[PDB]
Amino acid sequence: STRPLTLSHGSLEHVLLVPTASFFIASQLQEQFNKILPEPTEGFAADDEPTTPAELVGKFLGYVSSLVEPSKVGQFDQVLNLCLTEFENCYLEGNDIHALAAKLLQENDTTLVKTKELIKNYITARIMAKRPFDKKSNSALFRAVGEGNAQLVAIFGGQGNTDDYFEELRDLYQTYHVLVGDLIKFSAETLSELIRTTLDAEKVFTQGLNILEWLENPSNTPDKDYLLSIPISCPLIGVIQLAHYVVTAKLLGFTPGELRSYLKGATGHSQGLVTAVAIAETDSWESFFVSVRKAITVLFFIGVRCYEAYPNTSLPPSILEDSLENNEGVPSPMLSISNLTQEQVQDYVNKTNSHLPAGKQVEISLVNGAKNLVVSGPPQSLYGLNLTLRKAKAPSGLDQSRIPFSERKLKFSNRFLPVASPFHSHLLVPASDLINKDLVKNNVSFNAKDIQIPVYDTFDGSDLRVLSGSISERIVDCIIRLPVKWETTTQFKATHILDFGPGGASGLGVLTHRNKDGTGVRVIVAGTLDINPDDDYGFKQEIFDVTSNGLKKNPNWLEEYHPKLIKNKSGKIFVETKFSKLIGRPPLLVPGMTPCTVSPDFVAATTNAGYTIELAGGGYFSAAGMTAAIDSVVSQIEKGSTFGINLIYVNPFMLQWGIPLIKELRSKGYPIQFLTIGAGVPSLEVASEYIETLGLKYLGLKPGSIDAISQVINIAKAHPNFPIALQWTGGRGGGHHSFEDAHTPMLQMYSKIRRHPNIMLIFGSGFGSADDTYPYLTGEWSTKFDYPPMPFDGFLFGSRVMIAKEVKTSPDAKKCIAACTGVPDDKWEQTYKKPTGGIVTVRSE
Amino acid sequence: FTKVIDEPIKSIMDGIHDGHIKKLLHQYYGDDESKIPAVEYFGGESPVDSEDSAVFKATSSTDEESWFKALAGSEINWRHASFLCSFITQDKMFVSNPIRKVFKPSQGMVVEISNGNTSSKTVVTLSEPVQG
Amino acid sequence: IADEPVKASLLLHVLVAHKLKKSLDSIPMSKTIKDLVGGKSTVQNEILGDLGKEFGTTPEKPEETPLEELAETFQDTFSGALGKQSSSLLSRLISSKMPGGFTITVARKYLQTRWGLPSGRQDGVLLVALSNEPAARLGSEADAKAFLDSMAQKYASIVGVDL
Numbered sequence A: 001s002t003r004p005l006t007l008s009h010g011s012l013e014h015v016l017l018v019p020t021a022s023f024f025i026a027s028q029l030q031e032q033f034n035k036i037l038p039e040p041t042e043g044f045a046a047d048d049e050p051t052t053p054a055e056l057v058g059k060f061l062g063y064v065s066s067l068v069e070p071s072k073v074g075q076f077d078q079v080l081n082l083c084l085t086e087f088e089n090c091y092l093e094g095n096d097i098h099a100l101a102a103k104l105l106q107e108n109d110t111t112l113v114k115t116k117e118l119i120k121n122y123i124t125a126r127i128m129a130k131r132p133f134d135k136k137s138n139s140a141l142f143r144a145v146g147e148g149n150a151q152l153v154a155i156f157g158g159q160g161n162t163d164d165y166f167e168e169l170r171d172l173y174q175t176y177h178v179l180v181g182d183l184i185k186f187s188a189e190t191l192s193e194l195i196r197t198t199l200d201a202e203k204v205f206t207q208g209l210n211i212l213e214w215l216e217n218p219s220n221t222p223d224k225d226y227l228l229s230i231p232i233s234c235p236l237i238g239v240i241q242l243a244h245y246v247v248t249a250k251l252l253g254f255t256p257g258e259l260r261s262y263l264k265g266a267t268g269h270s271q272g273l274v275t276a277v278a279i280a281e282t283d284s285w286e287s288f289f290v291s292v293r294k295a296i297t298v299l300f301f302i303g304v305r306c307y308e309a310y311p312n313t314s315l316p317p318s319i320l321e322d323s324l325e326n327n328e329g330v331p332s333p334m335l336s337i338s339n340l341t342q343e344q345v346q347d348y349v350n351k352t353n354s355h356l357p358a359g360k361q362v363e364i365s366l367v368n369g370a371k372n373l374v375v376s377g378p379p380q381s382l383y384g385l386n387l388t389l390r391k392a393k394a395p396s397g398l399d400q401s402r403i404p405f406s407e408r409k410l411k412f413s414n415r416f417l418p419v420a421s422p423f424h425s426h427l428l429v430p431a432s433d434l435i436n437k438d439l440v441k442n443n444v445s446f447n448a449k450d451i452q453i454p455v456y457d458t459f460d461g462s463d464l465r466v467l468s469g470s471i472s473e474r475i476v477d478c479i480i481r482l483p484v485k486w487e488t489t490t491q492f493k494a495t496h497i498l499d500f501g502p503g504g505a506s507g508l509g510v511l512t513h514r515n516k517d518g519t520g521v522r523v524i525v526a527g528t529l530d531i532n533p534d535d536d537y538g539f540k541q542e543i544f545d546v547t548s549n550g551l552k553k554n555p556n557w558l559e560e561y562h563p564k565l566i567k568n569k570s571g572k573i574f575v576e577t578k579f580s581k582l583i584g585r586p587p588l589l590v591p592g593m594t595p596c597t598v599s600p601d602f603v604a605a606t607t608n609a610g611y612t613i614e615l616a617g618g619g620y621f622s623a624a625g626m627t628a629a630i631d632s633v634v635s636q637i638e639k640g641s642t643f644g645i646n647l648i649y650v651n652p653f654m655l656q657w658g659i660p661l662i663k664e665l666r667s668k669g670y671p672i673q674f675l676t677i678g679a680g681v682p683s684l685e686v687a688s689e690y691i692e693t694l695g696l697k698y699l700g701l702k703p704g705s706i707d708a709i710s711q712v713i714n715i716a717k718a719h720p721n722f723p724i725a726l727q728w729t730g731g732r733g734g735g736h737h738s739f740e741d742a743h744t745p746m747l748q749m750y751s752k753i754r755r756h757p758n759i760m761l762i763f764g765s766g767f768g769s770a771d772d773t774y775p776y777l778t779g780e781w782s783t784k785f786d787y788p789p790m791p792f793d794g795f796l797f798g799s800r801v802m803i804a805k806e807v808k809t810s811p812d813a814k815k816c817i818a819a820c821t822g823v824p825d826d827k828w829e830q831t832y833k834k835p836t837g838g839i840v841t842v843r844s845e
Numbered sequence B: 001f002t003k004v005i006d007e008p009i010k011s012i013m014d015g016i017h018d019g020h021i022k023k024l025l026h027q028y029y030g031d032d033e034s035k036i037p038a039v040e041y042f043g044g045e046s047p048v049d050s051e052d053s054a055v056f057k058a059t060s061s062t063d064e065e066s067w068f069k070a071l072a073g074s075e076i077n078w079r080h081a082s083f084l085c086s087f088i089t090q091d092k093m094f095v096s097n098p099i100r101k102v103f104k105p106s107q108g109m110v111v112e113i114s115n116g117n118t119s120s121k122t123v124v125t126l127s128e129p130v131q132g
Numbered sequence C: 001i002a003d004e005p006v007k008a009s010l011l012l013h014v015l016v017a018h019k020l021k022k023s024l025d026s027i028p029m030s031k032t033i034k035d036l037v038g039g040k041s042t043v044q045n046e047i048l049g050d051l052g053k054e055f056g057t058t059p060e061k062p063e064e065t066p067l068e069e070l071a072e073t074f075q076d077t078f079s080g081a082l083g084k085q086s087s088s089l090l091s092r093l094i095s096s097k098m099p100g101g102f103t104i105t106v107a108r109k110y111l112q113t114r115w116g117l118p119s120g121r122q123d124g125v126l127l128v129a130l131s132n133e134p135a136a137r138l139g140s141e142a143d144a145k146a147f148l149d150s151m152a153q154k155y156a157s158i159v160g161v162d163l
């Protein structure tokens, strides 16, 4: 016996099978809910109204859960439990709420605020219905950690990620009130007690620190400039990180102990490190309020004493006006300089610091990447630096594609971080001695034995458990004055990294992802629910998800593209790469060369050797002349053999007979395996005609510049099932050439290229033997630039095969070619000026 | 590296390929050719990505790619070629694989495979409705 | 009214302006295809390929010849015909950006009735329409008729016709 209740919002509907015993109460609740629900609109784009049935059921859960009291037993207990159980069974197929929240964003038109409202309501419901998170979630990632197929490390961010950090604390107080309401009230009480206890704290906290009043009423929340000042921003960034931790612990059904013991290790960036050591002390929910109280008390005293040591003073209006007119930030005590090496930046700061006195000197403070540094000093000094830099940088929109690589003006961004104090600088040193007394007055000491997981120092990367001195004093020293070598500390082996830190997509996680792309390390942003389009780093949902979509491993290029050996039944050994696997021949090609491969006898002789070669269209001026060439190639090769055709693009009058020719010859079934276009990457449209109209196996493209590589990646993505053969040659190549270095563009673009499995990446230019190509096959070539290994699928030899027997090149020309000494890659660009190893660059026809 | 004149193109390319093989063998196979995996034929694999007597009933919903992969089986042999090679060769020309055209999945089609493990003995038998 | 065949200097200027995705005014006829394109050889060679398909025979080095000398060298052989490349450009302007039911022949009837423009002028009005193709499809018939009317006055301004 069950009378169904029909609950609606315009077009979208849901049906609840309410038992006949309690339907009286459910009909009242249905009426009241439908009265509160606003009048439906088209699309549902209007706020406070559901977009999907799942949201509506959420809003109902939320509405009921508001009325029910968690202590007193009302009549609404049974209707709440029944609509929860019905919502679970219908929408959360065993999976976690965040998995459904994610699914709605990437499928439906649901906005992010409506999703967060749903999650709030579902969690609120679950807690008010006396249904806590007792049972351990079956999270894929945490299952895989128990088994041993995943190693989790927890990283905690710091300052300089976002200017609007407090909204992250507002979103936690709103969305997860019933989980972290008790934490935030405890932290706000501890802070309020420290203000009174500390002799002169009211002086540094001008507008008070009543964080609860600022959470309830966004009208009483002070301006961003006050909030950002370190005596607030330090403890509150702690609170946000600990809250994201608790939320993660509660939704997984773990106590902080269990969640800590599932981590191989933890570390932090700046004041993050204070959290990471407090996390490592955690055992059970009863003893978590001492581990938080430590981390709040430390972050409070750091933030107070470091402000008393170098308080931010009014900047001259002229300086602020200049900075805004040059598209730079608002001068702060920390400046981020992207796309310059650490030597280059240290050269500039050494020049700037030569003219400045001791108490105004800048210094490199964060080493975030190879080419990502943060300089910390007085904001004027850093404006000084910023002027020296704006002199040296090229214009941002300047095209240098036609300038030789060495003569190119170095390009680099530089913006001020949103931060109020100069962390990791000499300016905060006087604070040190004051902090190390405030910790021993409030009996705040981190002991080695109480830390159960290794926590990595930000300076040298060594564990903090194996120190002789105080860990609290060493952490303070690591935050206030000692620099942060992020690459050095994150040298730990781990498949998964959880960015608890503030900043979401602009936080420490995404930075750490960029640092160790292609090593097979998945970063998961554990604080922010969102949809990644590229899906290269995870969000909140991946931690909770119970399906295969919970455990996503990032590609390790050395493993995904490791070159192997294989053999036929005939016992012939092949080098097995993405490229050779398609064509069933060694991954060595002779590219279309005018006039070396215009000869049908050379094309046939190379094909007969079992090696792929392009017939150069450049040596033909008519469909008949090129038909007679192809006919001659086909008469000289064994049955089943194939070759390809190279067409120049800087010769557009050839393509208008050559492309229709290939189309006609493929329609008669001529053994043309593939077409390569030299001297320019076609547009998306013409490339799409070449792909489907020509009936080739694969398309070859020879990008010249980064912009051209990007164009090839676009053509690949448009047709994800068609194999594209991205033939990359540097400017060091024979014949028409680019201005580009052979390595640099591959370092930038290799990651992006491997995101498209249909691209078969072939390296050309400057190759003669197996000795010089082996590093590119293995991928070890890219270790010399401190990148991870980046294996290549195959190789092309142009200049090398010009003196072969079967090449029509005249004996005296072959003697002239053999005479040319040639030069190493470092000295290739001299061909633009003078004869260099018997070679020179000229402007062609 | 252009030094030896009138070296045959085969000798140049083999010399690179064999150089790679000899380095790869030393580094990743403890210099022992017996540890190199063997296949019937090496090729055909697009870069995108144990039952003796099976049966397969096509429908109108049947996915063409999963259909063929199923008929072909896991082992690389004459069947795998027959069902996944997109092109075959008539003398020197290259024409659409006629086996794939013929097995193209449609309602009523029923593929019995027998001795699907021993590639020498494997018989694939397509049966369709003919007068009911 | 008077039926004069479409000028090659207008046709060439439209095809270049359509390819570079710039307003007809933004391309000066004095600048060369190599100067205009700004080092993007692939765009320059697609322009030379469009010109080669449109007219047929082209001068020795058309990328270094300014658009004037190139226009008058095409005009010496130019029969006045619409072209094959312009057939495809106008076919895909009408199919992709005009309302469903509003074909090329209905626009050729409308502009003939409204302005009294023969097939030689109507070619020119459709060509100047191509050089500033609207980003989205005109859903309403009256917006398509307001665009075609505005394009006629812009064509009339360029040639020097008074309606």
Ligand SMILES: Cc1cc2nc3c(=O)[nH]c(=O)nc-3n(C[C@H](O)[C@H](O)[C@H](O)COP(=O)(O)O)c2cc1C
Residues within 6 Å of the ligand: A591, A592, A593, A594, A595, A596, A616, A618, A646, A648, A677, A678, A679, A702, A729, A732, A733, A734, A735, A736, A764, A765, A766, A767, A796, A797, A798, A799, A800
């Ligand atoms: C003599 C010669 C002729 C060439 N002809 C062409 C051609 O017609 N089309 C093309 O795309 N590339 C051509 N190239 C470039 C090669 O395809 C390839 O990029 C280059 O030779 C590889 O560099 P390497 O010669 O330093 O080994 C030619 C190269 C040489 C040396």
Ligand SMILES: *OP(=O)(O)OCC(C)(C)[C@@H](O)C(=O)NCCC(=O)NCCSC(=O)/C=C/C
Residues within 6 Å of the ligand: A594, A618, A648, A650, A678, A679, A680, A681, A702, A703, A704, A705, A729, A734, A735, A736, A737, A738, A739, C039, C040, C041, C042, C043
């Ligand atoms: O104007 P762009 O599109 O930039 O033209 C490309 C350009 C030829 C200038 C060059 O940078 C380039 O593409 N370099 C990469 C290597 C390449 O494509 N090599 C083959 C070119 S054709 C050739 O060698 C013909 C000789 C007769």
